[PDB]
Write a protein that binds this ligand. Structure first.
Ligand code: U2Y
Ligand code: CL
Length: 355
């Protein structure tokens, strides 16, 4: 029965490579602290290099999980409080309208007036500052969730400002080593560029992520399948890790509000387990992802929970999910975007067949 792990992924994930012309895919599964690694296709079409345990993928919005873990690390260490405001750390924002939104509201996209991306005009560091200086409120603060890169991006910058280090160093020198990650980078070094996969757009043209405003805390992490399986293992068994990172992980497993059947935790999206397939798919619907939605208090606190998160760049797709009481998790990494529903459906079929 331990061999069906390899067989179940070939039935549900492998057909997606041909269906959407995906050059490479890496699917990992952890069950009872045992890791399974399945690699498909090529990380580089022109180089005919196959996807392996060293292939580096762009995590996209799954990077937000590491930003949330970084915030939980600073909160437990006393460097921040979720009730603090960004002006306390970014001094030029003090008394500005954005200084009325606390850090927890920035991390959970409830500022009331922040869209999915920065405007196209916002590029340089000065233009990022001018954006949050001129920021005016719209919806009542804390009442409307709108999935936003600027929101959690500012949250990550404040976390970095409270740790007296730039954000990329916070992850690479503190968070990643605390999680046991060996090849996770905000900036991929030259000695690892041969492992950095090419992404592929809808025309199957090789591409990689471009520099952008607050790109690192919003979508700037690149990682490998063994590292992401270690990150899942850390989320499944935080009590096995040192106290500083363990309490950081626990900070990301607490829902703060609901939107229909989705509980918004720190970075992670939380659901009552067992969850229906449509519940997980609804989290990635256009209504939940692109539009504002009024939030409600957590009424039913689920005793048995599950967590997932989709992430995408222009040429990469990502999906991670784990179930603590089943001690099972899955990671999908692809060097071409496939519909979010397809990633969730395939992982839903794999997890339910392994009890
Ligand atoms: B994500 O939720 O994986 C995500 C969506 C969009 C962006 C973005 O702003 N850009 C420009 C990259 C496509 C990042 C992450
Ligand atoms: Cl300042």
């Amino acid at each position: 029965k331990d061999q069906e792990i390899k067989k179940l992924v070939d039935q549900n994930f492998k057909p997606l490579l041909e269906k959407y012309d995906v050059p490479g895919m890496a699917v990992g599964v952890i069950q009872n602290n045992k890791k399974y690694e399945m690699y498909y296709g090529l990380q580089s079409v022109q180089d005919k290099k196959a996807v392996n345990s060293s292939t580096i993928f762009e995590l996209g919005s799954v990077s937000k999980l590491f930003t949330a873990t970084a915030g939980g690390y600073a909160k437990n260490k006393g460097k921040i409080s979720f009730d603090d405001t960004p002006g306390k750390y970014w001094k030029v924002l003090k008394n500005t309208p954005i200084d009325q939104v606390n850090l927890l509201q920035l991390a959970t996209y409830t500022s009331g007036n922040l869209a999915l991306q920065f405007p196209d005009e916002v590029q340089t560091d000065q233009q990022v500052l001018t954006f949050f200086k001129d920021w005016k409120p719209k919806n009542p603060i804390g009442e409307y969730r709108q999935y936003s890169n600027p929101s959690i991006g500012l949250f990550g910058k404040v976390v970095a400002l409270s740790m007296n280090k730039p954000f990329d160093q916070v992850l690479e020198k503190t968070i990643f080593p605390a999680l046991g990650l060996k090849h996770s980078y905000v900036n991929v070094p030259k000695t690892q560029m041969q492992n950095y996969a090419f992404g592929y757009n809808q025309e199957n043209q090789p591409i990689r992520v471009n520099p952008g405003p607050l790109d690192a805390p919003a979508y700037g992490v690149k990682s490998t399948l063994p590292d992401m399986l270690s990150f899942i293992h850390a989320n499944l068994n935080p009590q096995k890790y040192p106290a500083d990172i363990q309490r950081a992980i626990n900070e990301t497993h607490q829902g703060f509000y609901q939107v229909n059947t989705m509980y918004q935790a720190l970075g992670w999206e939380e659901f009552s387990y067992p969850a229906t397939l449509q519940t997980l798919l609804d989290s990635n619907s256009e209504q939940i992802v692109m539009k504002p939605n009024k939030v409600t208090a957590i009424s039913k606190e689920p005793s048995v929970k599950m967590y997932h998160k989709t992430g995408s760049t222009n040429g990469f797709g990502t999906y991670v999910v784990f179930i603590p009481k089943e001690n099972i998790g899955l990671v999908m990494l692809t060097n071409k975007r496939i519909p979010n529903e397809e990633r969730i459906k395939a992982a839903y079929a794999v997890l339910n067949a392994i009890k």
